Design a binder for this molecule. Structure first.
Ligand code: 9C0
Ligand code: GLU
Ligand code: GLU
Lengths: 258, 258
């Protein structure tokens, strides 16, 4: 049986090939997670179909309806068999889906337009001239909503009521808002994506300060999946071979434009 | 029932208190993993007994007998219920025990005596004047034994036949060898331990170069354990609260002395 993979268009994890219009099926896509999916499938002995999550989201439980959206919802409601994506391992997600051991580390980080007078989360929290926000329906927004740490809770109180809205629907939208806001918007996003974007033309953004937390991305399966064990061992093998490190270098720094 | 915890004397994870002779049971010990054990036990609702692994080893399958030693052996053969220690998550261990998601990240790293003319693994591999080695019966030795990467395989070929032996029984022994060898021994160990020792008097050692790999420590349970799920969720909760970060700062840098 074909394993249905849910994933998300997020550079450099999954991207449309320039010539995608000329291609069919899995061959339309390229990136770190496209390469990882091929390796996991080879090691576990399955055939698969890459599908892009219909709503373009990572996944959160909707405030009103209590229904999971994004890739998490695709797994919870039986629409996909596995998620191979930069999907953060969290407690509330582990209650409803399984994760492999992590394939990549990350932490929440700050993106600024170059020259913005901000060095830290504390700096952001102590001012309002420079607006700041996060992606909707993902782990970064939930980090601020749940944090008991004074600085991060102060940031949440500001973000949740800021006008106009500081939240964005996609990473690309956060990046565009940093680039177009003349230093007046800073974006909170994962260090992996921040570091990729810092390498991309026109190299007008950068990561500042330390990471706010430390966590990982994992390959997720629905509870009860027969794939769980083999997928986990395959991630460990690919790490131990240095293949995950090779893929990070390939997609972050061999594509590097500054 | 009392949960029997296997752990290892490895600073700053588990250390004898200065006044341990005056104390009984769990109260004899202090450190990051002592604090972590108390938190995991509280969150999972169990009472526990800290025990120090009899052979002082992390764990490997003996070449001759194929019997697991160290903390891994304590779990495999039913002597302990859980390992709470800086125990690296590896494929061959995941086949025989379970691990939580990681509670800390690390990579293999190089420790030198200050002023040693070495900056990288490649530098070590291209010379023999400065001897270099690893801990026995752990994940670092196995990394070199199994590596297909040219520089690391060259290092393995040298280490496995070097005279006198470059391998040590405990981290303390590797550190002592670096300190007493006047620059003529470099020690390959995890970045966590390397960074701790760089802060300790007399501040005569340091970490050089990048990490050789990227991996994690996990809390381990024997296959079939009823503790597996609750332990994993407790690690995720402690991470999400910032408690793991607080404990790292407590044991590495709040008592650090350079
Ligand atoms: C949550 C923290 C503690 C920050 C963490 C620790 C380690 C990793 C990790 C990164 C890359 C590869 N691997 C291999 C599987 S692993 O050993 O389970 N962990 C990793 C990620 C996050
Ligand atoms: N990796 C995140 C999405 C990005 C973010 O929230 O910053 C998730 O799995 O929700
Ligand atoms: N953490 C390692 C021990 C230290 C090392 O091998 O450098 C293990 O679990 O085997």
């Amino acid at each position: 049986k074909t394993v249905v993979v849910t994933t998300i268009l997020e550079s450099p994890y999954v991207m449309m090939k320039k010539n995608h219009e000329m291609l069919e099926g899995n061959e339309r896509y390229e990136g770190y997670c496209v390469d990882l999916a091929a390796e996991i499938a080879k090691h576990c002995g399955f055939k698969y179909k890459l599908t892009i999550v219909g709503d373009g989201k990572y996944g959160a439980r909707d405030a009103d309806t209590k229904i999971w959206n994004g890739m998490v919802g695709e797994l919870v409601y039986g629409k996909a068999d596995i998620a191979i994506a930069p999907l953060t391992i969290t407690l509330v997600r582990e209650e409803v889906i399984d994760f492999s051991k992590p394939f990549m580390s990350l932490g929440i980080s700050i993106m600024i337009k170059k020259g913005t007078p901000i060095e830290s989360a504390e700096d952001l929290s102590k001012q309002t001239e420079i607006a700041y926000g996060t992606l909707d329906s993902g782990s970064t927004k939930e980090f601020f909503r749940r944090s008991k740490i004074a600085v991060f809770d102060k940031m949440w109180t500001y973000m949740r009521s800021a006008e106009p809205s500081v939240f964005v629907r996609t990473t690309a939208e956060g990046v565009a808002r940093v680039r177009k806001s003349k230093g007046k918007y800073a974006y909170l996003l994962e260090s992996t994506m921040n570091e990729y974007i810092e390498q991309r033309k026109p190299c007008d953004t950068m990561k500042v300060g330390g990471n706010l937390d430390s966590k990982g991305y994992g390959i997720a399966t629905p509870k009860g999946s027969s794939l769980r064990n083999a997928v986990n061992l395959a991630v460990l093998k690919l790490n131990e071979q240095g293949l995950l490190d090779k893929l990070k270098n390939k997609w972050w720094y061999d594509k590097g434009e500054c």
